[PDB]
Design a protein around this ligand. Sequence first.
Ligand SMILES: Cn1cc(-c2cc3c(N4CCN(c5ncccn5)CC4)ncnn3c2)cn1
Length: 293
Amino acid sequence: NNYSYIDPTQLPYDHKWEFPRNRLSFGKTLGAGAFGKVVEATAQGLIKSDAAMTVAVKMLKPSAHSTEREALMSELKVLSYLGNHENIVNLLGACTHGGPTLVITEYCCYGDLLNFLRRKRDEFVPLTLEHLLSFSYQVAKGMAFLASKNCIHRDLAARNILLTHGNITKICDFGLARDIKNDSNYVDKGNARLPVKWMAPESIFNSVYTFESDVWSYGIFLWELFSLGSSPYPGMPVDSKFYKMIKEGFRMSSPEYAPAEMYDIMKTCWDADPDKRPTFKQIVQDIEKQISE
Ligand SMILES: Cn1cc(-c2cc3c(N4CCN(c5ncccn5)CC4)ncnn3c2)cn1
C-alpha cells in the first residue's frame, strides 16, 4: 500500500496544453464516431505566435453522454502521459472550456495507410517493397514505444496508421488505449462493435487484451501491408465458421509481396499461445536485421 502504480488517468489535466478554441478554424471532417468527429483545422499561433498550422481536432458532440466525455479526457491524459514519439500522432493541445472538449493532434497529410496502399496498388513495383519494409519497421517502433510505457492500443490496423511528410507513419486513434498498470491485462467491459478480424482469439473469446494481443493485431497489419491493402480473411464473413476456424488454427497464407522473413513474423504474431508471440522489441530488432541485409 505504500507503493502503487500511478494511474495516468487519475492525474490532473496539465493546463500547459490549453489552447483557445477561437484560434482554430475547422475544415474537412476526417472521421466520425458516436463520440463526435475529427476534423482538419487551422490553428492560429499554436506553435509560433504569428504562424498558422494545420492540425487535427477531435471533438465531442454537444449531446455526448458521460461515458463519451470522460473517455475523451482519459484519452487526453494517456497521450499527455505517453509523451512525444515520431511514430504516433502526437498531442499538441486541448480546449477544455468554451464548448465541448477538443483534443488537438498532429495532422498527417497523406491520410491512412489502408487507403494509401489501395490508391498506389495499381502502380506498385517490387510504391516499392522498400517502402513496405520501412512502414513495417516504423509501426513496430511506435508499438514498442507504447508497450515500453505499459500501454496497449487495442485497435491496431492499417486504417489506424497515418502517413505524413517524409514517408513517416504514425499510429493514430488512442480512444481505446489503456495503461494496464498492475493487472498485466485488460478485460473489456464495453459492448461496442469490435474489429473482429484483427483480434487475438483470447480477446474474442474472453475479452482479454494484453501486450500480446496488440502483437496479434500487428501481424494482421503486416498482412494488410504486404497485400497492398486487401481486406483480411478474404471470402470469410464473421460468423460461427470464422470463430471455429480461428480457434482450430486457420491462418492467412503469405501475401504475394511479403518476403519470407516477414511472413515468418506474421506467423509468430498469430500463435494461439500468447506467450509464444514475439514482443514489439523483438520485432523491431528482426526487421532492423532485414533492412540492413
Ligand atoms: C483523406 N485524408 C484523411 C486524412 C487524415 C486523417 C487524420 C487523423 N485521424 C485520426 C483518427 N480519426 C478518427 N476517426 C474516427 C474516430 C476516431 N478517430 C480520423 C483520422 N488524425 C490526424 N491527421 N489526419 C489526416 C488526410 N487525408
